[PDB]
Design a protein around this ligand. Structure first.
Ligand SMILES: CC(=O)NCC1(c2ccccc2)CCOCC1
Ligand SMILES: CC(=O)NCC1(c2ccccc2)CCOCC1
Ligand SMILES: [Zn+2]
Ligand SMILES: [Zn+2]
Ligand SMILES: [Zn+2]
Ligand SMILES: [Zn+2]
Lengths: 360, 360
């Protein structure tokens, strides 16, 4: 059976489980079950399933080189699909809550969930809570007797927590650290002293790379009982590397990809985000360029947003991007090699992850 | 050592752990650590610690009747304090997120967290996420080697999920079920057909009673390795009973307790909540009273809120309350007796929980 159709079929299975349990154990009524069904579909479906399918791909790699009974291959593939959905539902939690946090309008060409007329923020914050709760109910039901249950739960736990901390670094990235204070309304930085490569790197490492690249790779290893085929420090290294590259691309598209292709209107400039563009610009600007950027960044006024786009265009940031790209291609290819030693399969799965990132 | 000072000391210990880990493992800087410290204190401290201290009380009960080395009594009491904080931090998550959901202003006489000038909703939704995340980091660190880790995690999981589902029943309690629809903006009910005792009971059972009464009692049993001293169906029964009574009292105070004593301005009438008062009123009103209530409920206009308070005052709902009270006192005393058989200690702890509820 093809991997994607397996994955999709398991979504239907998990959804039926979750809603049937709500009816048998949690006293839900049919209309609320239907609300939750629609919420799950709307928030979990319609992407490429990169994260979830990476767990399945990693597990298919090890199945090709490991001896098992057919029924055991099916159990492993079923566990990889459930684990993959746990990651998709965790991503759905963070996208629902982020969208509300940031006052986002669209995502992928459709309204953010909280904007649906019969949802509202009051319901959508708790719908997002529920999405994450569902990842735990999946794991305790499907993996109850599994040897990897504890490891999987503990890993998922740490990744969730890293992601929340990274949301904390992201939402505070335009403030001066020494001024953070719950008592005092937060001004936007004026010096931009914290728009540096290492600070940027910390934001992206925690906000994105743990759930998007580390978790899928590691969950694939866990459902396969294959953590001995890797040096886990290397898998963490490659995950954070590839995932930083991913975000650098998202930062560039927020500014430069037309909103119909982007699936939303990018507001990183108005939101004064610490993007790769801002940091890279400041790393090469002269005194007058720095002044013009300070006078214009983090302002809704479209004339001022156009002055920042203008400054970036004229700064040749394409060249710094090609150079970054080159260096990542170099370091990922090195880490692939290091992974090839203990596991060719796993190294190939990493290679595929890299190809799907580097191409898009 | 006195229980409360033990409990409080463990808060300092856990907080230092959590923030020190953020510095050693999650690359946090001092200013963000301080933000999180203040957020933890503000959101977790200043209540009566009923929930957390109930875990400690239950564990002290069993220590009096069970043979142990002193070092084992200290480990049990330390585990009961950590478990108690897990419940306090879980409550803190739900109060932060609820407050944002409901557009609340104050709680306990102080501004809701999201209203602090240097917080904002954008940060506060993720601060609430973090609060819950912290309950998992506590459990995996402090209870890593414990025989009860799996049971405790699985119980906490189910209780969290029940609470989220109960938030779903609460926020939708003024809508007609058959009209729930993410696509369509939700009208307030006009018939009030769903303001019934069993529907009310479902809302309160899930929103409050699992985390406030079941979890503390059960967590006390788990850290004590004492689940064999109870019939768990009875402990669930008594928890939901006592916790319904609790909420009936909160529903009556929302309407009738002056805001300086209440610690907030009650808006259940304007919010069209399915409160005990509304349900009990509708259960005894004549045709003209029902019409006047429909014409006035769920409206911000203070004149219309005063007409509902008026209708409730004249309906003698005090009498229905005394009758409810009587019947709960009766059924709790029966369940205490049933618990006394397998465990006098545990039955006494339940008795104390009941006294602290029934008195307040
Ligand atoms: C510095 C750094 O890389 N921290 C991430 C840690 C991690 C690893 C893997 C998944 C989630 C969290 C934090 C907890 O301890 C292990 C490292
Ligand atoms: C009908 C009812 O009481 N449901 C609550 C359940 C529960 C029990 C204890 C803690 C959390 C959840 C739901 C899951 O299965 C067990 C019953
Ligand atoms: Zn965001
Ligand atoms: Zn972006
Ligand atoms: Zn609420
Ligand atoms: Zn209330």
């Amino acid at each position: 059976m093809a991997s994607m159709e397996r994955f999709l079929s398991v979504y239907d299975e998990v959804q039926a489980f979750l809603l049937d349990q709500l009816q048998s154990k949690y006293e839900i009524d049919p209309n609320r079950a239907r609300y939750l069904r629609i919420m799950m579909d709307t928030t979990c479906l319609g992407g490429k399933y990169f994260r979830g399918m990476t767990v399945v791909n990693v597990a298919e790699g090890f199945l090709a080189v490991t001896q098992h009974d057919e029924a055991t291959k099916e159990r492993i593939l079923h566990d990889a699909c459930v684990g993959g959905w746990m990651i998709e539902f965790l991503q759905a939690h963070y996208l629902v809550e982020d969208d509300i946090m940031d006052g986002s309008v669209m995502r992928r060409g459709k309204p953010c969930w909280y904007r649906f007329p019969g949802v509202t923020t009051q319901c959508a914050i708790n719908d997002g809570i529920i999405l994450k709760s569902w990842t735990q109910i999946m794991a305790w039901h499907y993996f109850a007797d599994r040897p990897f249950l504890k490891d999987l739960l503990c890993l998922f736990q740490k990744v969730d927590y890293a992601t929340a901390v990274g949301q904390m670094y992201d939402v505070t990235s335009m403030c001066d650290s020494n001024k953070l204070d719950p008592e005092v309304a937060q001004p936007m930085t004026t010096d931009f002293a914290e728009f540096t490569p290492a600070i940027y790197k910390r934001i992206v490492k925690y906000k994105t790379t743990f759930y998007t690249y580390l978790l899928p790779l590691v969950m694939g290893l866990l459902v396969s009982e294959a953590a001995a085929s890797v040096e886990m420090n290397l898998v963490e290294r490659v995950a954070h590397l590839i995932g930083e590259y991913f975000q650098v691309q998202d930062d560039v598209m927020d500014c430069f990809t037309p909103p119909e292709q982007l699936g939303k209107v990018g507001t990183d400039i108005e939101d004064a985000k610490c993007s790769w563009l801002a940091v890279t610009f400041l790393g090469k600007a002269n005194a007058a360029q720095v002044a013009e950027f300070k006078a214009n960044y983090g302002e809704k006024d479209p004339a001022k947003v156009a002055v920042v786009k203008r400054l970036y265009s004229k700064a040749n940031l394409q060249a710094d991007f090609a150079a970054y790209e080159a260096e990542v291609v170099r370091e990922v290819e090195s880490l692939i090699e290091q992974l090839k030693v203990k596991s060719p399969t796993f190294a190939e799965s990493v290679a595929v992850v890299w190809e799907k990132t580097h191409k898009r």
